[PDB]
């Protein structure tokens, strides 16, 4: 309680080393959204952390 999961709106294939790939519906906890467009996140599927394009997720 007191936190929000995010969900992927679309599939995404990561292209750069620090980025996560994911499929539509995958759930995330956001770790840092303060440094621009690309948010640091943890996939709740894999447990991996990396950047995701913020326009590809929305709050649950």
């Amino acid at each position: 309680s007191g936190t929000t999961l995010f969900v992927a709106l679309y599939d995404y294939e990561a292209r750069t080393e620090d980025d996560l790939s994911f499929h539509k519906g995958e759930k995330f906890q956001i770790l840092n959204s303060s440094e621009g467009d690309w948010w640091e996140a943890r996939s709740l599927t894999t447990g991996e952390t990396g950047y995701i394009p913020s326009n590809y997720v929305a709050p649950v």
């Binding site: 990561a14 292209r15 750069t16 080393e17 620090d18 980025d19 790939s21 621009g36 467009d37 690309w38 950047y51």
Partner: peptide, 10 residues
């Protein structure tokens, strides 16, 4: 992978 560098200014 992914293999490409992440640009530091992104």
């Amino acid at each position: 992978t992914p293999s490409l560098p992440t640009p530091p200014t992104r």
